[PDB]
Amino acid sequence: YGEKLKEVFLMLDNNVVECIKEITESSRNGKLVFFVGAGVSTLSDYPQWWRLVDKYHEELYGSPKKGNYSSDEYLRIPQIFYNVKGEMAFDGILKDFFQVDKPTNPIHDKILAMNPAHVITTNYDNLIDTACWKRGKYFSVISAEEDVANATSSRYLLKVAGDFRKGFKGENVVLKEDDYLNYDQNYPLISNLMKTIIATHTIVFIGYGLGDYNINMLLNWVRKLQKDSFHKPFFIRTDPSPIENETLIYYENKGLRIIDAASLIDSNEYDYLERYSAVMDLLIESQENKFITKDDEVIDYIYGKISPLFALQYIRKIDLKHVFEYDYHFEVNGTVVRHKNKGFGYMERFFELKESCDERSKLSKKQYERFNALFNFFEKNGVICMAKDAGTLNTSIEINSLAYHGKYDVMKKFIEEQSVSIEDDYKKAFFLACLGRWEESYDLYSNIILNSIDESNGCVYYLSQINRYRIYQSITQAVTQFNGLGLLTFGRHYKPFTDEFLARIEREMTNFNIDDLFNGMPFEFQKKYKILEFLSDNQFLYDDTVKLFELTNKVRSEMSEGSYSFGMSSDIVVLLRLYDNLRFLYENCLWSVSFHEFHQYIRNSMSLLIEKAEYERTRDIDELGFSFFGKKSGFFMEYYDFVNISRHFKIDDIKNLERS
């Protein structure tokens, strides 16, 4: 059944494809809003209003009108019924006719599966509410006036015509054209909410007739009154007869984009289920996994997903998973594994593009530089190849930050040099911090945040804000300890800074709860650099210490067990996570490396992993290990981890590590 979807996709019109890609990118930002009504309710055998009209007709007459009633008498009959027979009979008929329990049809699940932000419906039923309830998502029900003020979430459910929730009483629901005429007089705030929500986002209609009624009001307001600054709404037509070409034109001028079903799938007249399913399917299958067929799509998509992160120096490989929305696992050694990609393999196909020599020629002129750039990105990052072809995979780390080397001589010469651009100023600020000259560096970050607001995507801005907060905390704890200890600190009543700096940072600072800064940056920022978000919380390391317990008993009590791990062993992977973490922190020049918590993390990691050479020392001389591990590869105390220990160990810690 998916294959037929592929065929119809490759047999769509060029007017369709732009609408599909528009819809899917709208979803990707979480900025899609449906408008669902009686069309879907028809599927679930939910009772239809015309049947109610016949019940009213038979209640006030004896037989139905001979033939169709009229194009003008559907509206008035219920009014007559209420006006002469009164309210109570109306209530009773509503209660008898409407009180039924039904299940949910799959179209509802499909519609919700595209994680819509807000839903605005005319369905008198509670069925869509039930569909929301089952799928674990929670939404606010706003049915009458009092609910509008008392909002309970940032996601909304607007039941325009009212609901039977509060009771089976007519006033709560819109049935009579008196209510249709005094709609503005009665329900102003709901109207304002509808107007604003339509204006602010992309709205997709479905399950609606072309004429109907509400469509008339929305188009009459939307199109004529406003200027040329709106996003055109989308509509799904599912009638049996195809829409004529000129009808498309007329509704195009009026400001709606039609997606006609009759050109999509062929069937009989009555198969409403199939048409709805097909139309919603052309959306749902291609979130973006399956429609990718030509090798050009592969490179455009991957470049779209990676190009923003070019600004940073390096991306932590373990974090790269979030880079692809949990589609593939990237292992620290340098391989890839498919875990959730249910579509045509793009990450797989990229490696074939990498190894390829001449089939790269089957490509356009503009993409070749893109492929080369991606090549450099993954080469610098550390991606090598794919799992089954992964053989010899020796790895050497290179932390290119001159600060980590501790070559302080070059740093001062670097500072006393003319600036060229903002990023150089950022490196300048970190280098000064490495020199510990905190105050002018603080004024520097203030200047950078002041200057870099006007420029492009504010990676520099966000990083500056985070580092500024960090230096604030460092100054706080530093002055706290200094003025708490007094002259006893260094045998001198040393006051490091002046009251001016203190007062300035206090009055400027006493605000700005960091815990929403990532929520404060524009949407393309949170989409494009969601990767960095983990730096925001004061919790960022504490996911790896979890993995140290791997070697506390399962590589330590298992060390007493004497079993051998084949291939990828816990000690080496933890040590590799260690290199990766230091590289990501230093080469991106974040001040968090200075803090005590990071010091403790490296302390634990180094101490626990170095507790491997003990094992058993002069043990029961085995024979199995000689065949696989002969001529023992001594754990070399290379300059990297030696520097690590030097920078992040206390002297008493040295005492314990030698004593044990």
Place this chain on the structure above:
Amino acid sequence: YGEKLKEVFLMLDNNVVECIKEITESSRNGKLVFFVGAGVSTLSDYPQWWRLVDKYHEELYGSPKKGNYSSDEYLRIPQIFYNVKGEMAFDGILKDFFQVDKPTNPIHDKILAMNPAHVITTNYDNLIDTACWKRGKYFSVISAEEDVANATSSRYLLKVAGDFRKGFKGENVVLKEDDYLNYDQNYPLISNLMKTIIATHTIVFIGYGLGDYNINMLLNWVRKLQKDSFHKPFFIRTDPSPIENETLIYYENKGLRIIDAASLIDSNEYDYLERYSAVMDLLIESQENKFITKDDEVIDYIYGKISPLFALQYIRKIDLKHVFEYDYHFEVNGTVVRHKNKGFGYMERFFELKESCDERSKLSKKQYERFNALFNFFEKNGVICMAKDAGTLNTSIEINSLAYHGKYDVMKKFIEEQSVSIEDDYKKAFFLACLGRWEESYDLYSNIILNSIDESNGCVYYLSQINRYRIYQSITQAVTQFNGLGLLTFGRHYKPFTDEFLARIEREMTNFNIDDLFNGMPFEFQKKYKILEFLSDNQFLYDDTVKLFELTNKVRSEMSEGSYSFGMSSDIVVLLRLYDNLRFLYENCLWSVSFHEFHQYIRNSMSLLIEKAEYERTRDIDELGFSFFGKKSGFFMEYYDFVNISRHFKIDDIKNLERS
């Protein structure tokens, strides 16, 4: 200055204090918006409208109008000029006297300080923008109709009158009466957005008079259309004269609250800055611990903070720190130490009013049973006293989990008993999951998730969701290693599980993602139940184990150094911590106790305990040791520790104890 504000607070009417409380609360939840206006610009010597109107007059005629101009010409003259003498001169004059750059004044700073989620202005100068730049709160500038749908943020800066961003030319702003008359017919979307922003938040006015055109228009709309479900906006009168009393009644009746400045401070007429500063700083004190020192409100505040937690049978003491926002350090032995309280000590007086039985009578009836409830709660939790009044404190662990007791014979009969409540169903679910019928447990979970949506305070919603996710994880790991080993597992290709249940579980949890569940929970829930958030991720098991490693090294150093420990030594600290973790986990009935990590944590902990006991057995007793801890009492191995070792150890793990 603080005591000045305190005495002022003593002389405030209850009206003002209630307004203060509501405003502070609204600011906390980010549902506050300000209306900053022309007067605020007038502080910073921004050109007032009157100079422009008199200039416009004097271009025409020969001399400025003698005396007060008129009640109409103030609106008439600009149109006379614009229509009669030509449009170009209007833009020329506007450029001539609307280019002066002038600095910010502190009023704007304090306006931005209080976290103004949205900003709505009628000022037509880009000064507040520069203030936003310096404070770096990134905001969306919406000048004309060309940007309403192009909002690159979720925070709005609405220039209702428009600005000069696009340039210095007439139509970009609304000054003339011709523009005023066709106000609706030019910015539909802007007006609709202004209405919607007005509706669904809380509003505070400043920089406005008492009869200005815009405010009268808005209040007209609000009071004449909206029925009874709006939040009345607030106002700050800034006139150098005491308002008349009946005016307050009149304005209140039309639906607006006045917070007078004359009733607040007495200064000279030409001290506008002082008036604004005083009124604003009566808001900046937003630490709200001085707020009513009356005895009952201590109990009311404490209740408002702790009461939502009746559902949980127990809560960890270490997390209880997170309840009161860093104010106090709650220790495992029951002693509370003030950490961040910088005002009235409510907690300090709570233990005191427990101690004083006679003083308890000095309370109203409603806060008696309430106190009784607050007596039971901390009694069951076990918070004994202040550190200052800390006497002989013992800990009798009372894990009441029948599952922890491992008494399954009563468990099975409890399972097949008629269910009385959803809470009883939850306990049945936990006992079933511990029993072995995973499919039955998941079946009961599948029914309760559907049933529980009916009620409020849906904590059980979260518990069932998380437990369902973890039990699918367990099912997946099962069907992994079970069929991985095959017949040799139990001497048969015996599949306990079939394919039916697979379909539903795979669909629902393949759709689902844990890593956002609390984010979707309505805001009332996350305000009330911030505690049960670490259960979603892994970190709750591990933010304690950092202390584990911190203490294992210290104990290992003291081991060889021969030093002595005193007071609350690390052993009892970790031992208590272990008990608290276990009791929370089992009383709350979450399946997370079934994973490897909690086990291994318990192994290392009680391993450290037994090693400490083994050393304490043969430790050399010095004179001080004999004076303080004579008659050696080795760590008694009790039933609780025995269950701990018995339940989750491996033969090698216990084995290495004997050699150790």
